[PDB]
Amino acid sequence: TSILDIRQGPKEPFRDYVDRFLKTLRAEQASQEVKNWMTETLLVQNANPDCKTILKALGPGATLEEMMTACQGVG
Amino acid sequence: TSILDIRQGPKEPFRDYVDRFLKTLRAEQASQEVKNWMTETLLVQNANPDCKTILKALGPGATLEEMMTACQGVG
Numbered sequence A, B: 001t002s003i004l005d006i007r008q009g010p011k012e013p014f015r016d017y018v019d020r021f022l023k024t025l026r027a028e029q030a031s032q033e034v035k036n037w038m039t040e041t042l043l044v045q046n047a048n049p050d051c052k053t054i055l056k057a058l059g060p061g062a063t064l065e066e067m068m069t070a071c072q073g074v075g
Helices: A014-027 A032-045 A049-057 A066-068 B014-025 B032-046 B049-057 B064-069
Strands: none
Touching: A014 A032, A014 A066, A014 B032, A014 B049, A032 A049, A032 B032, A049 A066, B014 B032, B032 B049, B032 B064, B049 B064
16 A cells, blocks of 8 residues: 555566556555656666666656566566 | 755755755655655755765665765765
8 A cells, every 4th residue: 555565576577567556656645746756766666676677777767658668578 | 845846956065955855855745654765765866966976876775864974075
């Protein structure tokens, strides 16, 4: 019930993690601008090590769709 | 009025930035566990370039007091 608790499994597809992250985010008490910032930063911090390293290599400013494209088939 | 808007000035002492960050955080609508996570991650992201680089070199898990010690006299 906290967005801080949604972490990607070591063999979970990135998009099934994003599904659980966005459903939990909808329930989180925070401003819409803080939710949009979590979607960029917390989604990367809570990714599994293989996706995390790919996402750090895109850097900030990657959109959510760009992040998902970069992680297809990883794990 | 958003915590995302509190950024360190290029010549502002780190502790005067932390003062403005903690006063704004008190007013932010979010859970206490999300406030404690902002104090570790968002405080580093919104630091000025010279403090930011010192704080990244401490890594995660540095406490707020450790972060402040590492930034004394910078700028």
